[PDB]
Ligand binder design. Sequence first.
Ligand SMILES: [Cl-]
Ligand SMILES: [Cl-]
Ligand SMILES: [Zn+2]
Ligand SMILES: [Zn+2]
Lengths: 30, 30, 30, 30, 30, 30, 21, 21, 21, 21, 21, 21
Amino acid sequence: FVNQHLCGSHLVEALYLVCGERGFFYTPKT
Amino acid sequence: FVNQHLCGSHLVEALYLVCGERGFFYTPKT
Amino acid sequence: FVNQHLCGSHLVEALYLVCGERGFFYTPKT
Amino acid sequence: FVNQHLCGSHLVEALYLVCGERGFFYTPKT
Amino acid sequence: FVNQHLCGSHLVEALYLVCGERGFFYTPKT
Amino acid sequence: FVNQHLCGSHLVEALYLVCGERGFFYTPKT
Amino acid sequence: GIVEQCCTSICSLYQLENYCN
Amino acid sequence: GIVEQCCTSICSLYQLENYCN
Amino acid sequence: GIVEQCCTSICSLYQLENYCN
Amino acid sequence: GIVEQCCTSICSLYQLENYCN
Amino acid sequence: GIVEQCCTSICSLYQLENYCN
Amino acid sequence: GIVEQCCTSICSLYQLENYCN
Ligand SMILES: [Cl-]
Ligand SMILES: [Cl-]
Ligand SMILES: [Zn+2]
Ligand SMILES: [Zn+2]
């Protein structure tokens, strides 16, 4: 795999694809 | 606003929209 | 709900989720 | 170019692509 | 059709819609 | 990581993620 | 309308231009 | 859970706020 | 307008709601 | 091909790497 | 190339069509 | 954190994997 530059909703899409049925938590600063 | 079917990556995109800086958990197993 | 920073197609996605079956109109400047 | 099924948020994404600065209406009720 | 400003995954979405069943190749520099 | 169904524009979005600067081919006819 | 033409049935990008302003 | 409420069934944006932190 | 506001500044879902048909 | 492996069936991200250049 | 052109400048759908198989 | 890192710099899928439940 290659490194990623992900902003906004694109990060959330990547998390969705990486985690699948396990799901994930999305926790920005502030 | 409305009620609709939100599935897969579309569901997490909607959570991102609605939650934003609060962050969110996506936990399909429940 | 939280405030939004939406550019390009991301605005159109947000409109789609907000309006549902009512639909919407997308009208940029110029 | 091609003909394909475009539904939901994918349909409005396609309208954004095709129309751009012209803008567009998405009116599913008709 | 209108001209396009497409970065990142947005270019790949546009290629998908333009090419349909023919598919496409995505070939960035470097 | 996980195994899941990836279809349509979601499949090419995943290829973009996984391949990045390597680039990729999407060839549904095979 | 657009859903019938493009989702239920299939449509070209030129048909999609029918719904531009 | 969220999939049952929003994908299998239908949900409002307010219901989606239930899954914010 | 709304398209520029949401991108150059910020906008709310309540403001977006005004563009529904 | 890729549609059969990843859409019709299921695939891992490593399998998806099979279609990189 | 096309990936950079579309992002740093602009590109047309007709230019994109050249990258179909 | 990861949300800022991925946007202001770069991040790997392996780093993202740490945020799965
Ligand atoms: Cl973007
Ligand atoms: Cl879909
Ligand atoms: Zn984007
Ligand atoms: Zn989809």
